[PDB]
RNA sequence: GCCCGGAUGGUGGAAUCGGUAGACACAAGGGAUCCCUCGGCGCGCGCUGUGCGGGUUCAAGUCCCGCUCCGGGUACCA
Ligand SMILES: CC(C)C[C@H](N)C(=O)NS(=O)(=O)OC[C@H]1O[C@@H](n2cnc3c(N)ncnc32)[C@H](O)[C@@H]1O
Ligand SMILES: [Mg+2]
């Protein structure tokens with residue numbers, strides 16, 4: 001043990017030891033109690049940034065802690081390797097997506113090894129290899145056989161010249177991000193998984209996930225959006241087809257004053273033939289973007305169809321309009337408007353002078369005031385013929401029933417959740433195992449032909465995908481005839497939905513999952529990833545686990561017992577617009593900034609001389625180039641400093657705006673820990689401790705040690721407030737540095753304390769603690785050392801602190817034997833001259849005593 | 861727009877079930893890796909102070925009603 005702490009002479013040594021003894025490689029040991037601690041797997045984007053560091057440090061803190069409690073901990077790592085970025089990056093780099101990705105993986109792997117996360121590298125997976133995606137192919141063909149898969153027309157973003165489909169990240173400020181041509185809606189048939197067949201189960205089972213946070217549970221209920229209502233069918237005067245709408249407010253029906261139909265609805269197309277105002281508005285509607293966001297800010301717009309639908313309870317002709325907020329693709333392409341009682345309908349009717357009819361009374365039973373806005377609150381009905389007078393429940397049921405009677409309405413459960421579109425028309429993904437025969441029939445790729453392998457050795461022109469460009473690739477023979485395979489590939493969420501199960505058995509060749517293995521490990525005891533994955537990934541992940549359950553491959557109902565969503569690590573983001581309108585994101589450390597009197601950024605240049613557009617803080621990521629790589633710091637300070645500082649910044653679940661200021665604190669603290677063990681072990685082996693011979697100064701200090709163990713255990717294991725854990729450990733280190741380490745008792749006691757501190761820091765700063773555990777001569781490798789237990793008999797307190805308030809203002813603090821009555825505390829409180837000062841002239845009207853904590857004398 | 865979160869000294873944050881505001885740290889200043897000062901306004905004291913406005917309570921960073929700004933997601937970024 002060198003006096004000075006040189007992490008560079010330590011971290012790599014300890015890292016080689018973990019690779020040689022395979023410390024973190026585990027099996028299905030049934031003699032041990034398992035713990036599966038899983039962190040959401042990285043997309044191999046290029047480099048790690050502090051967002052990954054945060055996520056993976058949290059997971060490793062939990063993994064090592066659980067291992068010290070004596071459990072068999074899987075903590076696996078892999079690469080969620082398909083996706084969009086590799087395509088653009090390939091072109092920009094005169095490469096192909098496959099090798100760019102494998103190098104990215106080689107690199108990030110090395111970065112992860114150098115932060116010393118105790119992964120089971122024997123179970124590493126890469127989702128872009130056929131050894132992986134073959135099973136999702138097979139699986140998807142089983143889903144099609146069970147009737148959970150179908151094809152429908154779906155709106156996509158489409159640069160009409162390049163004739164290529166764009167993701168929404170790629171459409172910008174109107175136009176595309178390549179060139180000056182405007183994106184367009186295009187309806188393209190695509191493959192869908194009926195996640196809506198599992199909607200109720202997904203909704204209901206949220207009430208069983210008592211160790212998931214409510215943020216995520218609510219976000220998911222509201223996303224599923226279950227609803228009971230009615231579907232009403234209308235006839236239309238000079239049109240031989242019916243219209244169907246769905247409403248949750250059948251009670252407001254008699255106030256339906258118009259219908260809206262989608263730009264692409266057949267009726268609007270028929271009408272647009274003879275109406276050039278309508279036709280121009282429909283052609284206008286192709287530029288409506290595919291995205292709830294921009295779809296809901298847009299000005300609401302419409303044209304009258306000229307057609308007139310018959311209200312089936314009043315027999316009153318009501319106009320049908322075409323409107324830019326009703327989409328053929330989601331629902332029946334028609335809605336009914338009740339402007340008196342739906343705010344969006346009010347605003348449309350206000351704009352285009354449509355009749356706004358009130359049919360629901362206010363809470364006190366007079367007619368509502370509709371001059372400024374729709375009345376949305378449920379109420380008694382008037383203006384509603386035979387339904388007048390009924391309350392909300394009643395009117396719902398009578399209108400529903402009348403409507404059923406007539407045979408034009410029906411009750412219906414309905415969800416905001418839509419089925420899951422898994423077709424992409426991009427190269428870099430798992431191919432979808434369907435086939436079209438010469439016939440024209442469609443079926444699954446048969447089993448003798450799985451996996452359908454994506455070729456890796458390609459040249460990419462940007463424009464097309466090479467599996468569509470070469471028409472020989474799609475050629476095959478099925479049922480003894482020429483057949484063509486599908487050249488669309490899977491949504492890369494498909495691979496991130498079952499990886500947690502494959503990590504249990506990654507080299508099993510006989511099928512998707514070794515169920516013995518999978519059931520030993522599952523369910524995941526803790527799942528750690530970003531709050532960004534609240535809905536999408538986490539819904540598909542649960543949906544998929546259920547589908548595997550229904551296939552009989554896993555016993556659990558839910559995949560993950562506890563979920564821990566970390567906050568996002570944020571960074572400023574900047575760009576300049578290039579020569580042909582390409583956005584060029586610049587990194588914060590290249591950006592020269594002049595700043596507000598309040599701290600907000602006012603101007604910004606790069607070194608080369610470009611006015612940057614400042615976009616604010618946002619998640620670190622390669623997309624916007626605002627990632628800070630940890631690699632520089634690790635080589636300056638050590639992995640243990642970077643790790644400690646991340647966990648000390650802020651609590652795991654809070655979103656953190658990254659800053660560099662603060663690392664020295666972490667580095668200096670580690671030098672003090674090092675210096676303390678060094679000075680203590682340099683002096684030799686220690687006497688056995690004599691618990692009950694201690695000075696009172698020693699009893700006090702042994703109490704703070706044991707109280708720290710209790711708090712840190714709770715902070716890591718139950719609260720996951722790592723910052724407070726670390727803070728409690730610093731406090732203690734501060735007292736330990738002031739304790740004289742001189743007689744044998746002091747030295748025995750410092751040994752206990754230090755053995756405990758070192759073990760407690762271990763999950764956070766394992767390289768330094770592995771080393772220090774050897775200088776203190778602890779048993780074996782710290783990686784398997786037992787986690788420390790607080791001795792209750794050391795933590796007994798004799799006295800406690802009471803705050804004395806007077807009308808709620810603190811006037812003193814007093815120590816008072818724990819065993820103290822209210823009468824005792826008043827008296828003592830009375831002795832304080834500053835309390836006395838505020839009791840003269842006045843009377844004690846009331847007294848509040850919170851046992852052992854606070855006295856408040858309420859005073860006139 | 862809609863759904864979910866957030867805001868505390870120059871800075872990151874602490875206060876775990878409504879009960880001491882600023883633990884533990886970074887920066888800064890002064891002194892010899894160690895000390896010491898460190899919310900604001902005016903001394904071994906008083907007032908005030910948790911984004912803004914009201915409210916409940918003996919007591920509010922915490923709870924109630926109404927807002928601003930910031931971030932996450934919004935179904936083809938992952
Ligand atoms: C399980 C699948 C859907 C995860 C996906 N491959 C993914 O999110 N990959 S990732 O972006 O490389 O992230 C890996 C994990 O780190 C979290 N994370 C990313 N970016 C982050 C920022 N900027 N701050 C905090 N956390 C970030 C992400 O949520 C993943 O959990
Ligand atoms: Mg602030």
Ligand SMILES: [Zn+2]
Nearest residue numbers: 159176178179
């Ligand atoms: Zn284009």
